[PDB]
Design a protein around this ligand. Structure first.
Ligand SMILES: Nc1nc2c(ncn2[C@@H]2O[C@H](COP(=O)(O)OP(=O)(O)O)[C@@H](O)[C@H]2O)c(=O)[nH]1
Ligand SMILES: *S(=O)(=O)c1cccc(S(=O)(=O)Nc2cccnn2)c1
Ligand SMILES: [Mg+2]
Length: 167
C-alpha cells in the first residue's frame, strides 16, 4: 500500500487539530492543546486502493524549528486551513503557502485550501473570496467542518489524489 505524507498548516485556532482528529479518529474534539504538534496515522481506502496517511498537525511555536523543517521537506502535500468566521486566518494563508513554496523550492506542490468551521453562521470570508485565492494559487478550495464532518474526507482525499497524480 502507498504511503502519503500530509501537512496541515494555518493560523492557531482554525481547526487543524479538530480536522486531523476527525479524519483519523472520527471524533470532534473541542479542547485540544494548541501547543501540541503531532503526527497521525490512518489506513484508508481512496479510489479502491488502500493508502497509508501520515499527517502532521502543526503548532505555532514550531513553525521555524529544524524538526518542522524536516517534516516540511519530506511532506508531500499541504492543507492550508483558515476558518470562515475569522478573517485574519484567511489573510494569513499567503504566509503559510509562501513557507511551503520556500521549503519545497518548487512551484509544483500538492496543496488544498481549506475553509473550516463551515457549520458556523457568523461567516466573515466569502466562498468566492476563497475560490479566487485558490484559483490564483492553482489549487482547489474545499469547505470543511470538523464538527459535522462536512468535506473532511474530501479535503484530505483531494490532497492525496493531487500527490498521486504528482508522482
Ligand atoms: N464550530 C466548529 N468549531 C471548530 C471546527 N474546527 C475546530 N473548531 C474549534 O475551534 C477551536 C480550535 O480548534 P483547533 O483544532 O485547536 O485549531 P488548531 O489550533 O488549528 O488546531 C476549538 O475549540 C475547536 O472546537 C469546526 O469545523 N467547527
Ligand atoms: S516524525 O516523528 O519524524 C514522524 C512521525 C510519523 C511519520 C513520519 S513520516 O511519515 O516519515 N514523515 C511525514 C512528513 C510530513 C507529514 N507526515 N509525515 C514522521
Ligand atoms: Mg492544534
Amino acid at each position: 500500500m502507498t504511503e502519503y505524507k500530509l501537512v496541515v498548516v494555518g493560523a492557531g485556532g482554525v481547526g487543524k487539530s479538530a480536522l486531523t482528529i476527525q479524519l483519523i479518529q472520527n471524533h470532534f474534539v473541542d479542547e485540544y492543546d494548541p501547543t501540541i504538534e503531532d503526527s497521525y496515522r490512518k489506513q484508508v481506502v481512496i479510489d479502491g486502493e488502500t493508502c497509508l496517511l501520515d499527517i502532521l498537525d502543526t503548532a505555532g511555536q514550531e513553525e521555524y524549528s529544524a524538526m518542522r523543517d524536516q517534516y516540511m521537506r519530506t511532506g508531500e502535500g499541504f492543507l492550508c486551513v483558515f476558518a470562515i468566521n475569522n478573517t485574519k486566518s484567511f489573510e494569513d494563508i499567503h504566509h503559510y503557502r509562501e513557507q511551503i513554496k520556500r521549503v519545497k523550492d518548487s512551484e509544483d506542490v500538492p496543496m488544498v485550501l481549506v475553509g473550516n468551521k463551515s457549520d458556523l453562521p457568523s461567516r466573515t470570508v466569502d466562498t468566492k473570496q476563497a475560490q479566487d485565492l485558490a484559483r490564483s494559487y492553482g489549487i482547489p478550495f474545499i469547505e470543511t467542518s470538523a464538527k459535522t464532518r462536512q468535506g473532511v474526507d474530501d479535503a484530505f482525499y483531494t490532497l492525496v489524489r493531487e500527490i498521486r497524480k504528482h508522482k
